[PDB]
Amino acid sequence: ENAETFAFQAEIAQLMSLIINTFYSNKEIYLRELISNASDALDKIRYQALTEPSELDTGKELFIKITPNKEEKTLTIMDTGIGMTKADLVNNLGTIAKSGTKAFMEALQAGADISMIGQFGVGFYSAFLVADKVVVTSKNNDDDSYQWESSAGGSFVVRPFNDPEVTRGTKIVMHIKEDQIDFLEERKIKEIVKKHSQFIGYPIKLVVE
Amino acid sequence: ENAETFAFQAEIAQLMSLIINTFYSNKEIYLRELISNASDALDKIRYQALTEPSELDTGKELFIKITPNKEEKTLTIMDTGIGMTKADLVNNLGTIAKSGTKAFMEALQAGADISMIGQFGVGFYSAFLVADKVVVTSKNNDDDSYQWESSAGGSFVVRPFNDPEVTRGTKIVMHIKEDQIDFLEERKIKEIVKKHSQFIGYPIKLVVE
Numbered sequence A, B: 001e002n003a004e005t006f007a008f009q010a011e012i013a014q015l016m017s018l019i020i021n022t023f024y025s026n027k028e029i030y031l032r033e034l035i036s037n038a039s040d041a042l043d044k045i046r047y048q049a050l051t052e053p054s055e056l057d058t059g060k061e062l063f064i065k066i067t068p069n070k071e072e073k074t075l076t077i078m079d080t081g082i083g084m085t086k087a088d089l090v091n092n093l094g095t096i097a098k099s100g101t102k103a104f105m106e107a108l109q110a111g112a113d114i115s116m117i118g119q120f121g122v123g124f125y126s127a128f129l130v131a132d133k134v135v136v137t138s139k140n141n142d143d144d145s146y147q148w149e150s151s152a153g154g155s156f157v158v159r160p161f162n163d164p165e166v167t168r169g170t171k172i173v174m175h176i177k178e179d180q181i182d183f184l185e186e187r188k189i190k191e192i193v194k195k196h197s198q199f200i201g202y203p204i205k206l207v208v209e
């Protein structure tokens, strides 16, 4: 079937614009948030396999892999976690109100740090701190493989998409803003993971390109 | 199926090598060769539709589209020509010897201009003058959609791949070398097309991304 275009719930769109359009000095927290989302997805498939071992027929190895691509100005974060169905992508990454959204916009306006984002249940949108466009390819055992994509602007699209690397899990491809390309450096990624994601229970693989 | 890997026939591998590893000025002829190939593919479907109009059920509009992406350092040339089956990709872009290959290598080493490539029946490999990697998505009415990819290793891969943009024809994505990013400029492209591809009988659309 075709690409379908969804609107972001209104407060999510406002938060996005505020995220993209306001200077923050502490942008590195996007990586903490996305790694923390991958870890939760990994937990969920790990616990599921304790009663249902065949949920790992789509891949036993549980990990996160980070791939900076300086030539193309993309940062990719992939995990072999539970993945998201078409409905999860539509429901969890844009259309449904989140209770923390509006509160976080108000906290930011009052001068709170951007690093609080995860506490408000909207950590995924930290990707827009460093990215102009974000593409999410995801395959859950209960659905076919789909792709969510948004350049902000109040809407996102979801289309069918098969990636032979994603047999179960989520690949997030961030298209890095010109003023944020520092985050594509091997050394910078290593430092941020080492300093802010040192307690994650899965291997984090960093591949250079 | 999944990805299959194919060795280039020996002389083609040697020609690709000579082409990537020797400095040539007049690299700009790659665009002329690729457009000429697109124009041939357009002609073939055009003539086919004269007796089998249902060959145009997969798209009536006959054109070429050029898309530079400076961010991603890619240049895309796309046509709605006859397209290539899996077998065409495998047979016509690498595995079968062409009689002009060796003759072209010796002509090059004897100092002939790179612009003569087309006259030797090997115009396609001019893409590797400006690109490190070339990815070809093609769909022919007699087969499923497939993708050919090479970084000139002495081999190429062919995998299944659907691109909603290609319902019939061919899309060439060139990953442009660091020193050749000038070819991504709107001004330069138009000027190369205006001077060297002047008499092509199909619309050539340029889209700036």
Ligand SMILES: Nc1ncnc2c1ncn2[C@@H]1O[C@H](COP(=O)(O)OP(=O)(O)O)[C@@H](O)[C@H]1O
Pocket: A033, A037, A038, A041, A079, A081, A082, A083, A084, A092, A093, A118, A120, A121, A122, A123, A124, A125, A169, A170
């Ligand atoms: N890597 C992922 N794999 C599976 N689902 C994810 C992934 N990243 C995000 N999601 C889904 O998107 C939702 C929103 O993420 P986020 O905005 O970080 O909020 P939170 O993690 O606080 O729930 C998650 O709860 C989860 O359902």
Ligand SMILES: Nc1ncnc2c1ncn2[C@@H]1O[C@H](COP(=O)(O)OP(=O)(O)O)[C@@H](O)[C@H]1O
Pocket: B033, B037, B038, B041, B079, B081, B082, B083, B084, B092, B093, B118, B120, B121, B122, B123, B124, B125, B169, B170
């Ligand atoms: N855009 C295209 N669409 C369909 N077939 C193509 C395309 N480009 C190249 N090919 C196939 O690859 C072959 C090799 O092309 P090339 O190396 O330029 O040689 P020639 O064009 O002299 O045949 C072509 O003959 C054609 O069969």
Ligand SMILES: [Zn+2]
Pocket: A033, A036, A037, A118, A121, A122, A123, A124
């Ligand atoms: Zn989160």
Ligand SMILES: [Zn+2]
Pocket: A141, A142
């Ligand atoms: Zn199930």
Ligand SMILES: [Zn+2]
Pocket: A086, A143, A144
């Ligand atoms: Zn479904």
Ligand SMILES: [Zn+2]
Pocket: A072, A073, A074, A175, A176, B071, B072
């Ligand atoms: Zn990009």
Ligand SMILES: [Zn+2]
Pocket: A182
């Ligand atoms: Zn800097």
Ligand SMILES: [Zn+2]
Pocket: A191
């Ligand atoms: Zn430091």
Ligand SMILES: [Zn+2]
Pocket: A028, A192, A195, A196
């Ligand atoms: Zn830090």
Ligand SMILES: [Zn+2]
Pocket: B033, B036, B037, B118, B121, B122, B123, B124
């Ligand atoms: Zn040709």
Ligand SMILES: [Zn+2]
Pocket: A071, A072, B072, B073, B074, B175, B176
């Ligand atoms: Zn590239």
Ligand SMILES: [Zn+2]
Pocket: B028, B191, B192, B195, B196
């Ligand atoms: Zn010229």
